[PDB]
Amino acid sequence: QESAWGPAATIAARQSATGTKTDTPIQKVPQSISVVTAEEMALHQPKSVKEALSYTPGVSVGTRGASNTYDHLIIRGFAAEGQSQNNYLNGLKLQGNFYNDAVIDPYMLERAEIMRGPVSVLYGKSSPGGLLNMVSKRPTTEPLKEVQFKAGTDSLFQTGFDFSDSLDDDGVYSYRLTGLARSANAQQKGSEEQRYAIAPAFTWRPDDKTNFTFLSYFQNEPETGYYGWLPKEGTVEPLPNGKRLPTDFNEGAKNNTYSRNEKMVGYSFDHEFNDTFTVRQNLRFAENKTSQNSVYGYGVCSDPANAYSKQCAALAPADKGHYLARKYVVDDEKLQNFSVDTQLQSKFATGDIDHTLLTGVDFMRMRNDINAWFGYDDSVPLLNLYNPNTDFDFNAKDPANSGPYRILNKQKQTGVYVQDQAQWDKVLVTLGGRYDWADQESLNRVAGTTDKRDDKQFTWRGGVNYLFDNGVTPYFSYSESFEPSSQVGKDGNIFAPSKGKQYEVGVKYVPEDRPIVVTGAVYNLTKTNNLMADPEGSFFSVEGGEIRARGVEIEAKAALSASVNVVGSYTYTDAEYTTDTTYKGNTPAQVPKHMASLWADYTFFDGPLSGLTLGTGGRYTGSSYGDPANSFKVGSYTVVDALVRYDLARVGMAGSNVALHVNNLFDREYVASCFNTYGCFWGAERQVVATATFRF
C-alpha cells in the first residue's frame, strides 16, 4: 500500500502542459519546470499558491512574510514589471494592473506548474524570471463528495466543499462545484482576513476526441489582511532602546480596509480531428475589483527618505529613531481582462524525424480604471514605536500633502507563435518563435492626458534534449523574453521593452522504472534595457540598464520506500546589476544567494499506528540585501514545518483524514525580507491548524 501524494509527486508530476503548450514529459522540456499536484497540496495544505511551491528551486515564495494579499513570486532573482505577479490560470495570463491582482485559492487548483526563465516564446510578454501556471480543478470521471473543515490558531475557520458528479449516466455531461469560506485573524493586530470563493465547472465530453470544459471562479474578499511596511529600525536592527517591534505589530490605522472581488468565466476546449491534427482553445473573461483604505509605514523619522519632514523635524534628534513616519493610499479599481488562446497541433514524420508542430494565435486585452488618492509626506501623524492605533480620516484629502491618481490603463497583446518539437531517435530539438503586437494606452483622468505605445517584438526559444535510456536527460536551451515598459522619459514617450535572454544547461533524471525525479540546471539570465536613474540631474528614468542572474538549481523528488517520500531543493543565485546608474555591481534586494528546502513524510502501514502520516520539513533562506544600495543585510533563517496526518479509512471513513499542520514549528522570529530601509516584513509566526477532510 502507498499514499496518494507519493506517486503524485514522482509520477503524475512528470506530465507538463506548461513550457511547451503540449502535454510533454518534463524530461522532454528544454527548460526548468516544477509541478505541484493537488495530492501534494492536499498533504501540505498550503495557505496560497506561494506556499505550495515551498520545496521547488529558483523561486522565493515568502519575501512578503506574513502577508497573503498577493501571490507575488521572485523567480531566479526577477519579478514582473512593476512588482506585479506573473501568474497564469489554465494557460491564460491572470493579467492585473496596479493593486488589481487576482489570486486563486489552492483548494481550487489541480496543479501548479512554475516555468523558470523566459517563456515569452509561448505566453507573450512575461518576466525574465519565469512564470507560474495554475490549473483549475476539472470535473472528475468518478463521483466526488468532499467536505473540509479547518480550525487553526489566530481564530482560523475554513469550511470548504468539493462536489463533482456526472449529470448523465454515460458521462458526457459532468460538473464540479468547489467552494470555501475562510475567516482568520491576521498576524498583525487589528487585521482580519475573510474569503469566499466558489468555482463552478462543467465538462461536455461527447466522446474521447472532443472535450469542452466551462471554467468559472468567483471570489469575494471583504478583508484581505495586512499589507503594510515596517522600518528596518525595529525589525532587522534593534530600536534605540535595544528592543524590537513585536511580530504582530500593525502600523496601520484602526479603520484600515482592503477588499477584492474576482469574477472570471471561461472555457477550455480541445478536439482531435485525427491522429495528425489536434485543436485547443482557451478562453477567459475576468472582472476584478479592488478597494482599499490603507495607512502604511514609511520608515523611522531618522530615515533619509524623511530627511526634511515637518513632523519629524519637530522631534528631538534622539526621538527621531523611534517614531514611524506614515502615509496612506485610498484606492478603488475595476479591471476587465479578456484572453483567448487557440492552438493547432500537427503531428507528422519527415523521414526518421518525428515532428510535433504547434501553431497558435493568442489574444489578450486588459482595461483597468484606477480611482486612487495617495498620501504624500506628512499626510499621516507620526506613530511612536515605544508605545505599549486610532482611526484615520481617509476623506480629508489635503492637496498640500496628498494627490489624486486617476488612470485608465488599456493593454492589448496579439501573438502568433510556431513551435516545433522534432525528435530524432534520442535527440529532441525544440525550436519555437513568437511575434507579438503589444499595444498599451494610459489616460490620466485628472489632466486628460494620454500615453500610448505600440510594440512589435519577436522572441524565440531553442533547446536540445538527449534522452538516455537510463533516464538521464542532459539539455541546453536559449530563451528570449520581452516586457513592455510602463514608464516614460523626459520627453513623455513610453520606453522600449526590456528584454530577457537566458542560456540554461541542465540535466534531468527521470527514470521510467523508478519513482525518482532529480533535475539540475545552471543558468545565465540577463535582463537588458532595464530602467535606471537619470545620471544627469533629473529624477526621470532612462533606458540602458542591465541585470544579470546566474545560478544553480537542484531539485529532487523520491519515494525511498513505500512509506517514505522526500522532496528537496537547493538554489544558488548570483544576481547583480551589470549596468546601472546607481546600484552598479550591487545585488537586487530580497534575493538570497543560497536557498534550500527539504521535506520528508513517513506513513505507517502496519501496527497500532497504521494509517498515521508524520511529515516534517525545513526551508532555509540565506542572507539577502535589504535595499538596492546594499546598505544593510537581512539575516538568514530556517523555518521548520511539521505535519501529523491520520487516515480515517480504518476507523470507518474511507478517503477521509484528519491532519494537524504546524508551520514555523520552533516559532522563529525572523524578518522575511526588505525591499528598502523603510519596507520590511516580519516572517509568519507559528501557526497550528487542525483540518478534517471527509469523503462521502
Binding site: 526634511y308 504624500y376 509626506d377 500633502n401 491618481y405 544600495a629
Partner: protein, 547 residues
C-alpha cells in the same frame, strides 16, 4: 526766512544717449555732484525730472517691480517626484518708467552693465525631487528657497541647510551703498523675464548661461544615498535684456511649460534729458529738516498751483477708485506735462487717471508735524480686490492742496517678495483657504541703505499710486504625459498638461482721507490666477506736509 521754505538750491542736467550697445536704455553718466548726492548724501531730497523727446516732462515718483515666474510639481506615485521654481525680479525707481542706476566701470555693454546695477534681474531658482514611492519632494525646493513659518506640506528646511543671499547681493533702485555713477531710463515698464522653470542642476557646476551674470550663489544638497531627496537653490543677478538660466536647465518653448519672453509695456514716449533738482530738504530718520537755501542766483522755488514762466512737471497720478478695471497686467500711464504746461497721461491702459503737477519757478514751506508707518504683513487675495492696509497719522488740510514729501525707506529686503506669485512658496496655495503665511525669499541681514524720495500731491479722497508690481507667471507642467501628474498651484487645473499663463498687478495707493489721516490701499488685479499672497514690502513711509 525762518518759515522753512523749500527751495531748489542747485540744478543739474544731462543728455541721454543710446550709446555702448544700449538698444532702448537711454542712459547717461550722472553729473559728479548728482552722483555724490545720490551716494554719499542720501538723506538730501533730490527730485529727478525726465524730459521726453516730445517735450513732455515727468518727475520720478514711486517704485515698480517686474516679476516673471514659473513652477511645476509633476509626480508619479510609483516612480519619482520632481519640482522646480524660477523667478526673475526687476525693479525700477519709478512707478511707470523703467529707471535705474549702474556703474560705467562694469564691463560689457549697458545692458550687461545693468547686471551690477539696480536694473538687473534678480533670478531665484529651486529644483528638487526624490525617486521613491508616494514622494512629495516636488515641494522641497520651494521649502528650501523660501523662509516660511507656516504649518503645511511636510518639508521645512533650516537656514544652515539652504542658501541665504546677503543683502549686498541684491540691487534695490534706491540703494545708496554701491557707488552708482550712471543712470538709465526707458519709456517702458520693468522687464518681466519669463524663462525657465528650474533652478541649478545638482550634477553640474551651477553656472548661469545666457545673460551676463554676477553675484551668483547656489546651494546644493546631493547626498550619495539614493533614497535621500535632492534639491538645489540658486541665485544670480543677470542682464535684464537676455534670458538667464542655469547650466543644463534651460526652458523648452513648448506647450507644457508655457511661453517665454521679455515683457515690458511701452508708453509711446522716448526720454531725451534728465534734470536733478537738489532741494534743502534733508531726511532725518523720522521727518525732514530744512537745511540750506537760507534767505540767491539760480534758486528755483516749488509750488502746487491749483490751476507761462512756471515750468510745470507732472509728479503723480490720482484716481477716484483703487480698482484699475483690468484683470491682468494693469499699466498706469505716465503723468507728464506738455511743453505748454498742459497735464496729460502718456500711455497705459488704466482709465480715470488725473495728472498732478508741480510748479518750478525762479513758498511751499515745510509744515511741522509729519508722520510715519511701516507697511508690514501679508495680504491674501482671492481675486481682484482692494484692501486698506495702512495709515499715516497727519492732517493734509493745512497743506497747500495735498502736497507732501514722501520717503520710502526699505528697512530690509522684503521688497523682493512684495510681489505675488513667484515671490512666495507656491505650496502655500495648496492648503486652500485664507491662510496668511509669511513665505519669503531667504535674504540675509540688511547692510544696504535703500531710500527713495519723492514730492507728490494727494487730492482729497483720491487714490495716488506709489508702488506697483506686475507679474507674468506660468503654472507649468514639466512634460505632457499621463504618467506624471502636474500640480495646479494657483490655477484650478492643467486641462491638458498645458502650462497656464497668469498675469497680475499689485498697486499700493496713498489716499488723502481728510480725516487727519492718510490711508494706504493695496489693490490686486489677476488673470488666470485663483489666489495670491502679497507680502507687504516692509516699507517705512515718512510723510511731511508742504504749505
Amino acid at each position: 526766512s525762518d518759515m522753512s521754505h523749500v527751495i531748489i538750491t542747485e540744478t543739474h542736467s544731462t543728455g541721454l544717449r543710446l550709446d555702448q550697445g544700449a538698444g532702448d536704455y537711454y542712459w547717461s553718466e550722472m553729473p559728479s555732484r548728482v552722483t555724490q548726492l545720490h551716494n554719499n548724501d542720501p538723506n538730501r531730497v533730490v527730485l529727478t525730472e525726465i524730459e521726453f523727446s516730445d517735450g513732455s516732462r515727468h518727475m520720478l515718483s514711486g517704485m515698480s517691480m517686474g516679476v516673471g515666474a514659473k513652477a511645476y510639481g509633476i509626480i508619479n506615485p510609483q516612480i519619482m517626484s520632481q519640482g522646480g521654481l524660477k523667478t526673475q525680479i526687476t525693479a525700477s525707481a519709478d512707478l511707470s518708467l523703467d529707471v535705474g542706476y549702474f556703474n560705467t566701470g562694469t564691463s560689457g555693454t549697458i545692458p550687461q552693465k545693468l547686471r551690477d546695477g539696480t536694473g538687473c534681474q534678480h533670478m531665484f531658482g529651486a529644483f528638487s525631487g526624490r525617486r521613491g514611492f508616494a514622494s512629495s519632494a516636488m515641494y522641497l525646493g520651494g521649502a528650501a528657497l523660501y523662509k516660511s513659518a507656516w504649518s503645511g506640506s511636510g518639508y521645512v528646511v533650516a537656514d544652515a541647510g539652504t542658501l541665504t543671499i546677503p543683502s549686498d547681493y541684491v540691487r534695490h533702485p534706491g540703494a545708496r551703498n554701491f557707488g552708482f555713477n550712471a543712470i538709465y531710463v526707458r519709456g517702458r515698464s520693468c522687464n518681466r523675464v519669463l524663462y525657465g522653470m528650474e533652478g541649478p542642476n545638482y550634477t553640474t557646476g551651477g553656472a548661469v548661461q545666457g545673460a551676463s551674470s554676477s553675484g551668483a550663489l547656489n546651494f546644493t544638497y546631493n547626498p550619495s544615498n539614493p533614497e535621500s531627496p535632492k534639491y538645489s537653490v540658486g541665485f544670480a543677478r543677470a542682464d535684464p535684456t537676455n534670458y538667464a538660466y542655469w547650466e543644463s536647465m534651460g526652458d523648452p518653448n513648448d506647450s507644457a511649460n508655457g511661453p517665454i519672453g521679455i515683457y515690458s509695456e511701452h508708453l509711446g514716449i522716448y526720454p531725451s534729458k534728465i534734470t536733478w533738482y537738489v532741494t534743502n530738504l534733508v531726511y532725518n530718520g523720522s521727518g525732514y529738516n530744512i537745511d540750506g537755501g537760507l534767505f540767491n542766483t539760480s534758486w528755483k522755488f516749488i509750488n502746487f498751483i491749483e490751476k507761462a514762466d512756471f515750468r510745470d512737471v507732472g509728479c503723480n497720478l490720482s484716481k477716484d477708485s483703487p480698482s484699475t478695471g483690468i484683470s491682468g497686467i494693469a499699466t498706469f500711464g505716465l503723468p507728464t506735462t506738455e511743453s505748454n504746461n498742459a497735464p496729460s497721461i502718456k500711455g497705459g491702459n488704466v482709465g480715470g487717471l488725473h495728472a498732478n503737477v508741480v510748479s518750478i519757478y525762479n513758498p511751499l514751506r515745510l509744515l511741522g508735524g509729519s508722520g510715519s508707518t511701516i507697511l508690514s504683513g501679508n495680504i491674501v487675495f482671492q481675486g481682484n480686490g482692494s484692501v486698506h492696509v495702512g495709515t499715516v497719522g497727519l492732517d493734509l488740510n493745512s497743506s497747500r492742496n495735498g502736497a507732501i514729501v514722501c520717503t520710502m525707506e526699505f528697512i530690509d529686503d522684503t521688497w523682493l517678495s512684495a510681489g505675488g506669485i513667484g515671490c512666495f512658496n507656491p505650496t502655500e496655495m495648496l492648503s486652500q483657504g485664507a491662510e496668511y503665511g509669511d513665505s519669503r525669499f531667504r535674504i540675509g541681514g540688511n547692510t544696504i541703505n535703500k531710500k527713495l524720495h519723492q514730492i507728490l500731491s494727494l487730492p482729497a479722497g483720491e487714490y495716488v499710486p506709489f508702488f506697483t508690481i506686475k507679474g507674468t507667471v506660468v503654472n507649468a507642467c514639466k512634460l505632457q504625459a499621463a504618467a506624471y501628474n502636474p500640480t495646479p498651484y494657483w490655477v484650478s487645473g492643467l486641462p491638458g498638461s498645458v502650462g497656464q499663463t497668469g498675469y497680475y498687478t499689485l498697486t499700493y495707493y496713498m489716499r488723502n482721507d481728510g480725516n487727519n489721516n492718510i490711508s494706504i490701499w493695496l489693490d490686486s488685479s489677476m488673470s488666470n490666477i485663483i489666489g495670491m499672497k502679497a507680502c507687504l514690502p516692509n516699507i517705512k513711509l515718512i510723510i511731511q506736509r508742504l504749505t
